[PDB]
Amino acid sequence: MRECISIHVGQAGVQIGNACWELYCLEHGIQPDGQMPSDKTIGGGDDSFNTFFSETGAGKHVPRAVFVDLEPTVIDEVRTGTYRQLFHPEQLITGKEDAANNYARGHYTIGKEIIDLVLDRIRKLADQCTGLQGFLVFHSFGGGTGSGFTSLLMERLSVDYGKKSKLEFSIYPAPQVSTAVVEPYNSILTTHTTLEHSDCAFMVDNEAIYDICRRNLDIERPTYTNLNRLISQIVSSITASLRFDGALNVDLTEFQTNLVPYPRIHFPLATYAPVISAEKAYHEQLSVAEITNACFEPANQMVKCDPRHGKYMACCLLYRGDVVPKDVNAAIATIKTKRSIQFVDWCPTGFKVGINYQPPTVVPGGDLAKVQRAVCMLSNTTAIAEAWARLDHKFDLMYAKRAFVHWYVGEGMEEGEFSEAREDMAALEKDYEEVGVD
Amino acid sequence: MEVIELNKCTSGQSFEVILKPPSDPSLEEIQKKLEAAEERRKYQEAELLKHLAE
Amino acid sequence: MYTFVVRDENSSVYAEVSRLLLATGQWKRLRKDNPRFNLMLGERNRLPFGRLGHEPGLVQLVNYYRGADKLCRKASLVKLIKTSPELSESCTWFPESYVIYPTNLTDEREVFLAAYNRRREGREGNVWIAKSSAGAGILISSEASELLDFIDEQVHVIQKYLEKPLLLEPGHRKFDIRSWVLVDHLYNIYLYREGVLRTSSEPYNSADKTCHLTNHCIQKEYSKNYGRYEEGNEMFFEEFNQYLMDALNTTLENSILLQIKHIIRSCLMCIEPAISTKHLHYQSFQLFGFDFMVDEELKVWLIEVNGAPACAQKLYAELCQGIVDVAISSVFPLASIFIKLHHHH
Amino acid sequence: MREIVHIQAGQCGNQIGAKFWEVISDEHGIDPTGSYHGDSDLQLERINVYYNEATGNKYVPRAILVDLEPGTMDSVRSGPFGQIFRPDNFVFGQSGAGNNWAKGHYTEGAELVDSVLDVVRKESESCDCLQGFQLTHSLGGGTGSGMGTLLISKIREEYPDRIMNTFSVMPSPKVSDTVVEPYNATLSVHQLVENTDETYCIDNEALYDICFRTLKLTTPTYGDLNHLVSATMSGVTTCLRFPGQLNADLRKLAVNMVPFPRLHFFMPGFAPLTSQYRALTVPELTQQMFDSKNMMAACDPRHGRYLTVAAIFRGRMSMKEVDEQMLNVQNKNSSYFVEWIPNNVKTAVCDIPPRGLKMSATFIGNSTAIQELFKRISEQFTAMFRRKAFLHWYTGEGMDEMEFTEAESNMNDLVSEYQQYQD
Numbered sequence A: 001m002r003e004c005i006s007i008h009v010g011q012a013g014v015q016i017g018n019a020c021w022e023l024y025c026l027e028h029g030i031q032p033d034g035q036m037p038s039d040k041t042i043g044g045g046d047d048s049f050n051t052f053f054s055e056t057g058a059g060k061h062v063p064r065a066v067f068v069d070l071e072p073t074v075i076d077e078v079r080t081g082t083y084r085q086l087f088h089p090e091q092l093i094t095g096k097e098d099a100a101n102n103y104a105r106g107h108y109t110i111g112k113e114i115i116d117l118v119l120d121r122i123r124k125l126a127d128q129c130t131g132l133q134g135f136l137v138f139h140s141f142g143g144g145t146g147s148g149f150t151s152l153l154m155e156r157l158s159v160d161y162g163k164k165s166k167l168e169f170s171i172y173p174a175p176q177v178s179t180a181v182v183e184p185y186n187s188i189l190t191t192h193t194t195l196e197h198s199d200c201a202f203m204v205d206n207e208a209i210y211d212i213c214r215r216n217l218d219i220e221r222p223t224y225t226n227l228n229r230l231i232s233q234i235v236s237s238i239t240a241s242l243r244f245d246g247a248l249n250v251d252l253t254e255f256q257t258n259l260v261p262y263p264r265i266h267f268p269l270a271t272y273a274p275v276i277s278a279e280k281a282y283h284e285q286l287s288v289a290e291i292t293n294a295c296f297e298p299a300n301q302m303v304k305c306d307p308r309h310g311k312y313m314a315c316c317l318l319y320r321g322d323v324v325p326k327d328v329n330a331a332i333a334t335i336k337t338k339r340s341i342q343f344v345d346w347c348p349t350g351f352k353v354g355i356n357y358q359p360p361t362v363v364p365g366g367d368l369a370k371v372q373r374a375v376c377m378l379s380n381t382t383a384i385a386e387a388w389a390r391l392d393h394k395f396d397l398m399y400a401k402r403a404f405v406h407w408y409v410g411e412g413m414e415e416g417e418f419s420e421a422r423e424d425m426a427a428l429e430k431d432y433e434e435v436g437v438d
Numbered sequence B: 001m002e003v004i005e006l007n008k009c010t011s012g013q014s015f016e017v018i019l020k021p022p023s024d025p026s027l028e029e030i031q032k033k034l035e036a037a038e039e040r041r042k043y044q045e046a047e048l049l050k051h052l053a054e
Numbered sequence C: 001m002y003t004f005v006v007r008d009e010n011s012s013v014y015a016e017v018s019r020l021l022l023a024t025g026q027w028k029r030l031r032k033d034n035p036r037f038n039l040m041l042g043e044r045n046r047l048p049f050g051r052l053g054h055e056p057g058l059v060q061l062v063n064y065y066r067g068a069d070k071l072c073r074k075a076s077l078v079k080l081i082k083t084s085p086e087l088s089e090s091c092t093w094f095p096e097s098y099v100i101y102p103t104n105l106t107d108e109r110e111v112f113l114a115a116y117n118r119r120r121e122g123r124e125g126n127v128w129i130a131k132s133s134a135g136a137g138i139l140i141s142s143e144a145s146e147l148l149d150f151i152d153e154q155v156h157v158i159q160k161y162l163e164k165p166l167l168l169e170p171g172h173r174k175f176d177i178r179s180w181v182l183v184d185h186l187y188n189i190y191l192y193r194e195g196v197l198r199t200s201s202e203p204y205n206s207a208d209k210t211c212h213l214t215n216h217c218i219q220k221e222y223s224k225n226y227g228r229y230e231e232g233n234e235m236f237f238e239e240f241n242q243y244l245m246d247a248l249n250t251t252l253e254n255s256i257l258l259q260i261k262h263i264i265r266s267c268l269m270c271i272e273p274a275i276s277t278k279h280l281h282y283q284s285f286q287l288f289g290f291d292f293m294v295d296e297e298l299k300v301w302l303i304e305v306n307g308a309p310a311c312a313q314k315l316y317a318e319l320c321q322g323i324v325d326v327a328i329s330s331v332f333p334l335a336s337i338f339i340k341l342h343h344h345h
Numbered sequence D: 001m002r003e004i005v006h007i008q009a010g011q012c013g014n015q016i017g018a019k020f021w022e023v024i025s026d027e028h029g030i031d032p033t034g035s036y037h038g039d040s041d042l043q044l045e046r047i048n049v050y051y052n053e054a055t056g057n058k059y060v061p062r063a064i065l066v067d068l069e070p071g072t073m074d075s076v077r078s079g080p081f082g083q084i085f086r087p088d089n090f091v092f093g094q095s096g097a098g099n100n101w102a103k104g105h106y107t108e109g110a111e112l113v114d115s116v117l118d119v120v121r122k123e124s125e126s127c128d129c130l131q132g133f134q135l136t137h138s139l140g141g142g143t144g145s146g147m148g149t150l151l152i153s154k155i156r157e158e159y160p161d162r163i164m165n166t167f168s169v170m171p172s173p174k175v176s177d178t179v180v181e182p183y184n185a186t187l188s189v190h191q192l193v194e195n196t197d198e199t200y201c202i203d204n205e206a207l208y209d210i211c212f213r214t215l216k217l218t219t220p221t222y223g224d225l226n227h228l229v230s231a232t233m234s235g236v237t238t239c240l241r242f243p244g245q246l247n248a249d250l251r252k253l254a255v256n257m258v259p260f261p262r263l264h265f266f267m268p269g270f271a272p273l274t275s276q277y278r279a280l281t282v283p284e285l286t287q288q289m290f291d292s293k294n295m296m297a298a299c300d301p302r303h304g305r306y307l308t309v310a311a312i313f314r315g316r317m318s319m320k321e322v323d324e325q326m327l328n329v330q331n332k333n334s335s336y337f338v339e340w341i342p343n344n345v346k347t348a349v350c351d352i353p354p355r356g357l358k359m360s361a362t363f364i365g366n367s368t369a370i371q372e373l374f375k376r377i378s379e380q381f382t383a384m385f386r387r388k389a390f391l392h393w394y395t396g397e398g399m400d401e402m403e404f405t406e407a408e409s410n411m412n413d414l415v416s417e418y419q420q421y422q423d
């Protein structure tokens, strides 16, 4: 057994993290006070769930997580929330004034004053691990803390834990819920300085989550709570292999091995199905073929884009619930004869499948209905570069006039870093086109 | 379509299906950048105070 | 009040469509770089499809199908027909074609020569034609050596030259049929009732490319009988149908039009899964130009599909209005000239 | 605990500041005695942004009252909610400023500014996390304009890493007290260009027109003008005083609203403006909110382009319909929003409506059309300065003609800077 440490940065990272650990507890039968009746090894053990939870002599299962935010209002929710008993105070780190949606403020000005404290708190959790695999970092692209401080933390983590893997869950900005006009700036700045420090990053576009909530859950004006509930389901499906007995994606290293043949192209596309409204008392349960076929519908992807006009480098199918391999192969064969699935020549045309018999867990009183089987597809498609093109275009529009640039220069950042980060994104876009286009 | 590496346990099973064969900066450098940016802030603020002193 | 942007100033078809939209008083044109548009008359090359359908509260429609180039490229079309089971290499309405990359650069050089020798030995007509998408540069020869050497001098394709074309009388001349097809956001296939025949004003000689290439630009530049028989070497369906009844005792619908509609459906239905925008965050429509060849046996052959075609001068007003009616107004209603080719989605 | 320190200087600044505190005190359930008598926890959620808490569960506004004459501040103390202000926060002299910028900025004001900074320092020292300062004042007088900009300059020197925000009333010949108002306003504008991050431009010409043309007030008074300003100030500060996600503090607001440091002068707007029990639909609020007749700067928005826009909707309404209407405005008039700042319109919603209204909307716009306001002041300034008329009132206080020439050039530069971004 090898431990994983979760790091949540900024409002988006913290709130998403709160929803994930809530779902983890429900899945592993852990009560809000940290007790776990099914765990017979009191105060210890090297079970699969121990990769995310430590154990005290009193039987409390404490998440291996750190919450960081340059403003205390969001983390104070966890300090008095339902699962306040799970985390000890050393795990919750808060500043006083936030980064004001300014990457430079989060990376240089305020980040420089709290970076050592965060690392020391991370070191405490690392010392409790017999064999640490790496870290899972949750954050937004558009926030000043999520973008600026995360990039600073990732750099230091590479220095202090050079051999450990690092995976990201990143929130891509969408105007329908955005809170700042400069979020395209912060997205590119943080992607530039974090690219060489991340082994695998799962981008979630708020636009896609927002529309899925309105379309499939009949939510007129989805809130962050609605969005995070759905995001936590996708995150749970991705991390389920690390927390339950299995043979696929059993460690963080395997994520890179199975999903990332080229280091810079480490942004797999996530697709989830089915998303059913809880208000619908009786819904026709979808079959294995139907939910598998829905994995190739753009309307179910975490990032809106058209994989038909790109090429695949890898593909994993993560099933939860009543699913047997025979039904998966039959659905795959049918899909090949009706879908446009082009792989790169230097990669095999196949799917790595994982099945967990436990069906997806739903938060009581939530918006997601209980389903007998669900699937999350992780595919490394070049089509996800459409999100980079969209983001880079907005960057170009504002930077051509130097709009808002003075806010970043005023924090000590040099104007050259803007063009340096943009040139790196231009190269990233070029790599995708070389791999997916003829 | 070939199924390979079938692993089964109590909580589930995994396998692979193939449809077609194929055809960092050091801590020193980090602190220099952080201090360099902090120094530019001090220079900018000193100029403002100089302007206000005039 | 709907909004649209124009990103292809060289499109004569959509220049009229843009003019008609404004005349309705319900469409407002925006700068070509304004993202808050309902309709985009996009450019021909590198249309930013990735930036479409990401504007909250805006239904966005574009006048091109992403991925349709596979059908509107010489080499792409050949590869699509051979590799697609819906079309198969045994396709009967498409001339035997091969893709030949220049030696200075898969390729089908050895496969082309294998079938070439079979015709030379078999005494059959062994005249082929070489062409590419980088032309106005076409070579017609009966010796494979000249065809391959010409390519080496851009990827080109070589297909069998129809040595027995249907010749119009009086004149003993060649021609080709241009059909305009509109595919809306629902992937309904609308065939414009009005077609045009771009006829050659020179008598066909099977022993000079003026009487072999029916291009309107070549007939008006290198031909000395331009406009002798019909105005601008363009014969419309009304006259052509009358000729077929008087000369061959048949109609255009039975002898030719049935095969044209069959070919249009086969091509468009084949790529439907790859370009359909049924469940996509933006919608697409596109006007296509199909060019066919008719032999002396009244068999229709597909030559090329143009994704950015023009229209006949006399047919601009009617066709462009139909585009706004079925393709634009169907998605953006305001305050038939097509033949619907029904199919299975 | 992001506290804001409020400062109101001069006659106009104190009369509008007093009405502002009266309005928001009612919204938060605070009575004239400082006791809370509300019925919702949302009222106290962010009460500490503007109020300190004293013994006995009393809430004391974090406001400093400044003036070179005692008259107006005596009325505030003897008026509605006058007893709620901290007695030590009344800082006043006896000489006055004679509607003279030099007197407020260089002579009379300099004699008093240190005692004001002492009160500011005392208020800032007891702040857990000071956001910055908001100043209410006019630009046409002497104390608010001259001593107000002197205070800002000295506050920035002592708190350079804090946000400086002002509500600045712009003079107009329609509602004028002295002919020297263009002089005082031009001198103040350059101070604001350099030393503030956010300035809400309130034009007395617009306030009068709204009272007369829209509200049907045949003879508007300053009291009537201040009613509009009170309601506007309450709307623009809604995002600061109640739980929210967008523009929740002064710095984040500045980051969203100010693409260039000097172009930080905003046009405020309010809706509805009725002469009264009829319900106003969400589409109606949106149209009125963007209507020029509901603007406070007397600048035609169609004469320029919006760099950034902040919208605030208050009351119980369909947030879905709010988003639809806001997107309809942007999509039906996209030519008036610059295209090089994507998604430059941000919308916020607050459940608590203002007193007497079920639904309201507040508009905050950064438009290049604001140059019309500075052009107007520049023309009036030059009409007198070309003849050196009335300058002796200023040269008598030590000022030189050169300083007026520099102020004239500085504001013409500001007009030119707005003109380059409008094309």
Ligand SMILES: Nc1nc2c(ncn2[C@@H]2O[C@H](COP(=O)(O)OP(=O)(O)OP(=O)(O)O)[C@@H](O)[C@H]2O)c(=O)[nH]1
Pocket: A009, A010, A011, A012, A013, A015, A016, A069, A070, A071, A098, A099, A100, A101, A102, A106, A140, A141, A142, A143, A144, A145, A146, A147, A171, A172, A173, A174, A177, A178, A179, A183, A206, A224, A227, A228, A231
């Ligand atoms: N899905 C989701 N997105 C969020 C959530 N909270 C914020 N965001 C998005 O994150 C972006 C803003 O970043 P934040 O995380 O709020 O800012 P921050 O990390 O706290 O940094 P500061 O600027 O210092 O506040 C916006 O695009 C929001 O839409 C959340 O709870 N769930």
Ligand SMILES: Nc1ncnc2c1ncn2[C@@H]1O[C@H](COP(=O)(O)OP(=O)(O)CP(=O)(O)O)[C@@H](O)[C@H]1O
Pocket: C095, C129, C131, C135, C136, C159, C160, C161, C162, C175, C176, C212, C213, C214, C215, C291, C293, C303, C304, C306
């Ligand atoms: N296989 C073939 N057999 C007989 N004639 C052929 C032929 N391929 C091409 N041609 C002749 O050559 C002409 C031009 O060829 P093609 O259509 O490929 O050129 P192009 O694409 O530049 C013109 P357009 O875009 O209008 O079709 C045809 O109109 C036809 O007359």
Ligand SMILES: Nc1nc2c(ncn2[C@@H]2O[C@H](COP(=O)(O)OP(=O)(O)O)[C@@H](O)[C@H]2O)c(=O)[nH]1
Pocket: D009, D010, D011, D012, D013, D015, D016, D097, D098, D099, D100, D138, D139, D140, D141, D142, D143, D144, D145, D169, D170, D171, D172, D175, D176, D177, D181, D204, D207, D222, D223, D225, D226, D229
């Ligand atoms: N809106 C409004 N404007 C005022 C009020 N009192 C004065 N003014 C304006 O302010 C300017 C005079 O400045 P004033 O505040 O009286 O001078 P000060 O006391 O020296 O700062 C003139 O342009 C007046 O029109 C008021 O109560 N409301």
Ligand SMILES: [Ca+2]
Pocket: A039, A040, A041, A042, A043, A044, A045, A046, A055
């Ligand atoms: Ca145990």
Ligand SMILES: [Ca+2]
Pocket: A158, A162, A196, A197, B024
């Ligand atoms: Ca590394």
Ligand SMILES: [Ca+2]
Pocket: D111
């Ligand atoms: Ca004195």
Ligand SMILES: [Mg+2]
Pocket: A010, A011, A071, A098, A143, A145
């Ligand atoms: Mg924050």
Ligand SMILES: [Mg+2]
Pocket: C304, C305, C306
């Ligand atoms: Mg063509």
Ligand SMILES: [Mg+2]
Pocket: D011, D012, D141, D177
């Ligand atoms: Mg006065």
